[PDB]
Amino acid sequence: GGFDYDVVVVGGGFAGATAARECGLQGYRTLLLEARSRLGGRTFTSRFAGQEIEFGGAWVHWLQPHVWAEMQRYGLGVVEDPLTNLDKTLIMYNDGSVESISPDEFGKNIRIAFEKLCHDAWEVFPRPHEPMFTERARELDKSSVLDRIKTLGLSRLQQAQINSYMALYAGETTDKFGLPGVLKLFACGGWNYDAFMDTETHYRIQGGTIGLINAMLTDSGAEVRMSVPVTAVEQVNGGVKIKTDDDEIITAGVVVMTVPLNTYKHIGFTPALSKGKQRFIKEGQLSKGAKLYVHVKQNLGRVFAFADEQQPLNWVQTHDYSDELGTILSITIARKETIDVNDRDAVTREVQKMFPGVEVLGTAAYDWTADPFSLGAYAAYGVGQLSRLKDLQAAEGRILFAGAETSNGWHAYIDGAVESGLRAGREVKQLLSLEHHH
Ligand SMILES: Cc1cc2nc3c(=O)[nH]c(=O)nc-3n(C[C@H](O)[C@H](O)[C@H](O)COP(=O)(O)OP(=O)(O)OC[C@H]3O[C@@H](n4cnc5c(N)ncnc54)[C@H](O)[C@@H]3O)c2cc1C
Numbered sequence: 479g480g481f482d483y484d485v486v487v488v489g490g491g492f493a494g495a496t497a498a499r500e501c502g503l504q505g506y507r508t509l510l511l512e513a514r515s516r517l518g519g520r521t522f523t524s525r526f527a528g529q530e531i532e533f534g535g536a537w538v539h540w541l542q543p544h545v546w547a548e549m550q551r552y553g554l555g556v557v558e559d560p561l562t563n564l565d566k567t568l569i570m571y572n573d574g575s576v577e578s579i580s581p582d583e584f585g586k587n588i589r590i591a592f593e594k595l596c597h598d599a600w601e602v603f604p605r606p607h608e609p610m611f612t613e614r615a616r617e618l619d620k621s622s623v624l625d626r627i628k629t630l631g632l633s634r635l636q637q638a639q640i641n642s643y644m645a646l647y648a649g650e651t652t653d654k655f656g657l658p659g660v661l662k663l664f665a666c667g668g669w670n671y672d673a674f675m676d677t678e679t680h681y682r683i684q685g686g687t688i689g690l691i692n693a694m695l696t697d698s699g700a701e702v703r704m705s706v707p708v709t710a711v712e713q714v715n716g717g718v719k720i721k722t723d724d725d726e727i728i729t730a731g732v733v734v735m736t737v738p739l740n741t742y743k744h745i746g747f748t749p750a751l752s753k754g755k756q757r758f759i760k761e762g763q764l765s766k767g768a769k770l771y772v773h774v775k776q777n778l779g780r781v782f783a784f785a786d787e788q789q790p791l792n793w794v795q796t797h798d799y800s801d802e803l804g805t806i807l808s809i810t811i812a813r814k815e816t817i818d819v820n821d822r823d824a825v826t827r828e829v830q831k832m833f834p835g836v837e838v839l840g841t842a843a844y845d846w847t848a849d850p851f852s853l854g855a856y857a858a859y860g861v862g863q864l865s866r867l868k869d870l871q872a873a874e875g876r877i878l879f880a881g882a883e884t885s886n887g888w889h890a891y892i893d894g895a896v897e898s899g900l901r902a903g904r905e906v907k908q909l910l911s912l913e914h915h916h
Pocket residue numbers: 488489490491492493494511512513514517518519520521533534535536537538679706707708709736737738741744745768769810846851852854855856857880881882883889890891892893894895
């Protein structure tokens with residue numbers, strides 16, 4: 479009806495890229511606005527110490543249906559990051575003490591702890607993609623992961639392991655981490671430890687995440703604008719007026735918001751969003767971590783380590799290793815407040831506090847929690863949030879909402895973002911059609 483564009487997609491992560499592809503291919507005049515000067519959002523492929531790395535999400539699996547189907551469409555295969563026959567497996571406790579565990583007794587103890595925590599996933603989530611199907615799922619949304627970890631009677635090692643694991647998934651202390659979200663994720667993977675674990679940091683996309691992002695946006699035909707942050711959305715005249723941070727207005731029939739939930743405080747809405755959505759906007763989601771790579775010139779082979787929630791290096795892994803190269807450690811930090819990643823002294827310190835005979839040569843980090851356009855990492859639900867997710871998914875007039883947080887399945891993954899983007903495309907068609915179906 480005379481607007482600048484039929485649809486504006488705010489955000490150039492996987493959710494926005496997918497929503498723009500769906501829309502563009504319908505023939506809609508489509509615009510995507512990205513605040514950063516790069517695409518990918520919470521995925522970001524860079525380079526460090528001579529090789530391609532990934533500062534955010536990177537690992538996918540065929541059991542993740544939405545992203546997998548997109549890899550078929552665009553013909554992208556997988557690249558395997560094996561870690562068979564590990565050389566060292568460590569557990570660092572809340573006290574800072576570091577125990578080298580035998581690798582095979584390591585995995586078996588985490589399996590016991592994991593399978594005990596997810597003992598009722600089959601029953602609670604018969605339909606992982608309808609999380610609130612069973613009533614017990616809704617009751618369990620009054621408990622936290624720690625509430626249950628305390629009722630499982632695990633050994634000392636097993637408790638530290640699962641809590642590190644769960645603290646990483648939460649990017650927070652396990653007492654704030656909603657319990658159902660974890661069970662549903664396990665269900666998505668087939669209610670089976672071996673299957674779920676096979677999706678963990680195992681397979682990467684040929685050509686990186688940015689390759690799939692580009693393949694979607696190229697396919698879409700949409701206009702794409704970088705370094706254009708959106709500061710306000712106003713519903714008016716049968717459409718929307720979108721305001722950028724340099725005060726220029728763009729009109730559209732509809733808007734698809736795909737920005738991370740934690741970044742919504744930076745955007746004004748007229749009229750106001752529903753109270754349910756507002757509650758979500760002020761609560762946010764939990765994760766407040768960072769990503770960190772380190773370069774050691776002391777070959778360490780295949781390595782893994784947990785650290786409980788009171789140490790910084792909660793999830794450590796070997797990205798590569800050569801007698802020449804030394805080792806490059808891939809590390810995910812659950813809470814950035816436990817360590818300043820952009821300080822080479824504290825990093826070298828804490829790294830050596832786990833691998834004492836190490837010389838720290840080079841480091842590269844990404845502080846997702848300090849970045850104004852993520853203000854966090856992967857989606858992590860608090861207690862009682864999953865039960866209210868409909869409030870976050872609901873359309874508000876001619877404003878639709880997507881993003882991994884708003885997905886039903888793999889909400890902490892690329893796949894969730896893709897899923898939410900397919901939904902946004904469908905909701906856009908309903909709003910701009912000849913026969914409607916809201
Ligand atoms: C450290 C880390 C490890 C993870 N590992 C994996 C993994 O291995 N595998 C996996 O599948 N998932 C993983 N996850 C989670 C995952 O990557 C995300 O679920 C996924 O990338 C989310 O995409 P999104 O489109 O929903 O949101 P985002 O990727 O955050 O997209 C949001 C976009 O909106 C933009 N934006 C924000 N505010 C504005 C504004 N005001 N105006 C305009 N644009 C704005 C942002 O710049 C950004 O591009 C990881 C994530 C992180 C951070």
